[PDB]
């Protein structure tokens, strides 16, 4: 079930899944439609679901990681697609080898130095590239 803010933006949550508290490398996942492309893992908030809960849930589903939820980085809109994503830091403390999306759709994941994450997100997911700006 998709949920929506009162303005009709689909509600989403995501995490910047960093390898360590140094926040130098982040985990991206492949696009579900176009697997040669990378994205920040995230997805729809469910009804009555806290965003931090959704974020953590989605990165579990899409990236197969768990960790220490850190700060909310921010709330990011994609105007073209009409969705609004709460983006948290998550310091990955657990990397699961098989996860929901790896199994169901063959989703991939890869660590990128922040600057390289930005680079590969830029073309198709520039909003996501912007998650890293600060
Ligand atoms: O079809 P796209 O290019 O517009 O992007 C796709 C994006 O695909 P991706 O970024 O992987 O290429 C999906 O992401 P996902 O399939 O990787 O999860 C994402 O779904 P979502 O992340 O919002 O939702 P869930 O993760 O499932 O809860 C949305 O797909 P959906 O129509 O199945 O809910 C998104 O579509 P829009 O929100 O309409 O932009
Ligand atoms: Cl790191
Ligand atoms: Cl986006
Ligand atoms: Mg998703």
**Is 61 labeled as catalytic in the residue annotation?**
yes
39, 31 Cβ separation under 8 angstroms: yes
CB atoms within 10 A of CB 98: 8
What gap in Å lies between CA 128 and CA 103, rounded to an integer?
A: 24
What CATH topology corresponds to 1-134? Nucleoside Triphosphate Pyrophosphohydrolase (3.90.79)
* Residue that the structure tokens 């689909």 belong to: 10
> Longest C-alpha distance within the chain, in Å?
38
62, 100 Cβ separation under 8 angstroms: yes
For 73-96, the DSSP string reads: EEEEEETTTTEEEEEEEEEEEEE-
Find the length of the chain.
134
C-alpha distances (whole Å) from 28 to each of 33, 66, 70, 107, 134 are 15, 14, 17, 10, 17
45, 55 Cβ separation under 8 angstroms: no
Find the 33 Cα to ligand 1 centroid distance in Å: 8
Ion ligand 3 neighbours (CB, 5 A) are 78, 127-128
In this structure, the residues whose C-beta lies within 6 A of any atom of ligand 1 are 12, 31-34, 39, 42-44, 58, 81, 83
84, 12 Cβ separation under 8 angstroms: yes
C-alpha distances (whole Å) from 102 to each of 45, 59, 96, 114, 123 are 20, 12, 10, 23, 23
C-alpha distances (whole Å) from 123 to each of 6, 67, 129 are 30, 28, 9
CA angle 124, 86, 21 (to 5 degrees): 90
Please tell me the experimental approach by which this structure was elucidated.
Answer: X-ray
Phi, psi of 17 (to 5 degrees): -95, 100
* Residue that the structure tokens 């590239």 belong to: 129
Phi, psi of 127 (to 5 degrees): -65, -40
Q: Which of 24, 48, 49, 61 is catalytic?
A: 61
CA-based nearest residue to 110, from 57, 10, 37, 47: 37
């Amino acid at each position: 079930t998709r949920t929506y803010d009162g303005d009709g933006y689909k509600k989403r949550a995501a995490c910047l899944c960093f390898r360590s508290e140094s926040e130098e490398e982040v985990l991206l996942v492949s696009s579900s439609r176009h697997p040669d492309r990378w994205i920040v893992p995230g997805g729809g908030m469910e009804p009555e679901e806290e965003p931090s809960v959704a974020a953590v849930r989605e990165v579990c589903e899409e990236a197969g990681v768990k960790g220490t939820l850190g700060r909310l980085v921010g709330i990011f809109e994609n105007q073209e697609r009409k969705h609004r994503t709460y983006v948290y830091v998550l310091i990955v403390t657990e990397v699961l080898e098989d996860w929901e999306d790896s199994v169901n759709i063959g989703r991939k994941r890869e660590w990128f130095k922040i600057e390289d994450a930005i680079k590969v997100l830029q073309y198709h997911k520039p909003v996501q590239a912007s998650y890293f700006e600060t």
